[PDB]
Design a binder for these strands. Structure first.
Lengths: 118, 97, 97
RNA sequence: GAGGGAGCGCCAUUGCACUCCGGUGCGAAGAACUC
């Protein structure tokens, strides 16, 4: 409910947030919804995270549709707080985006190839 | 040269990255008064100068009597007053003194 | 105190972040000779203090005599010698255990 | 606002370390900074 276009099941969301806890020490990820909206229109994002419980929906409501337009994968996660501690900041985080395929590209390409089947 | 609230330092170590160089000038010159801006040269290969802009000329002349010849990064500063608005030109031109 | 390779500075301005401060103390202390290390922390119990590890104790005592009370970030440093050798001096005499 | 991308305050602390580690308000729903 209800800017979430598709549901995804808990433990796929959790390798997602732990995988993003591990990509900061090889690649580069952009935190917060302005740097991720900017990650995407620059045309750099390779997979983007959206929190389900952001509280004016409009802060992230444009993210799903500006991921479908230039074909960027995106995943929903329940609490912005867990995405916050996932990306490494000390507040909550509404949306993040990996931006470098430093060395773990197979393990996220799998994960995207699980996003498709819904 | 006649007094002026901006002092012009050269013989600064050229090899030192410039944010650090600005902050180290601040470290040693905040003692003398409010600094409006620290303006270092760029870079690396050409020599090293910087204008530190005090807000009051007495502070600038304080820097100058006191820190003259002081070994900043093991190189004694040659310090004098800035000439006729040299600092505002050096900030224009692009690239950085 | 007995001289020592390492100086203990305190009454440092505590509002200044760790790397900026290490590299400002190299800026003003490199003059007196090779610095093996500069150790600063901002734990509750180590706010406002730093250890500067010179390679030759003559550098330490020339440093402690010249920079005594020098207003670093508009605050006069207290320099004395370290009470015990730093680990790395210890290993250079070894002594380290 | 456009950029930017993680700090900015307050209280306490004068403290001799080398495994790291006070409290607390605000801050990715955008700190500092630049225009």
């Amino acid at each position: 409910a209800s800017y979430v276009k598709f549901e995804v099941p808990e433990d796929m969301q959790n390798e997602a947030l732990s995988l993003l806890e591990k990509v900061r020490e090889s690649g580069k990820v952009k935190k917060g919804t302005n740097e991720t909206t900017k990650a995407v229109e620059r045309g750099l994002a390779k997979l983007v995270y959206i929190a389900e419980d952001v509280d004016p929906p409009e802060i992230v409501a444009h993210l799903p549709l500006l991921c479908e337009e230039k074909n960027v994968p995106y995943i929903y996660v329940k609490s912005k707080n867990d995405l916050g501690r996932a990306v490494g900041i000390e507040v909550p985080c509404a949306s993040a985006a990996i931006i470098n395929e430093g060395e773990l590209r197979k393990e996220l390409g799998s994960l995207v190839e699980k996003i498709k089947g819904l | 040269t006649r007094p002026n609230h901006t002092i012009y330092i050269n013989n600064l170590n050229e090899k030192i990255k410039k944010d650090e160089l600005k902050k180290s000038l601040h470290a040693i010159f905040s003692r003398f008064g409010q600094i409006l801006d620290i303006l270092v040269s760029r870079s690396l290969k050409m020599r090293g100068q910087a204008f530190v802009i005090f807000k009051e000329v007495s502070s600038a002349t304080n820097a100058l009597r006191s820190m003259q010849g002081f070994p900043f990064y093991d190189k004694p500063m040659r310090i004098q007053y800035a000439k006729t608005d040299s600092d505002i030109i050096a900030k224009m031109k692009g690239t950085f003194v």
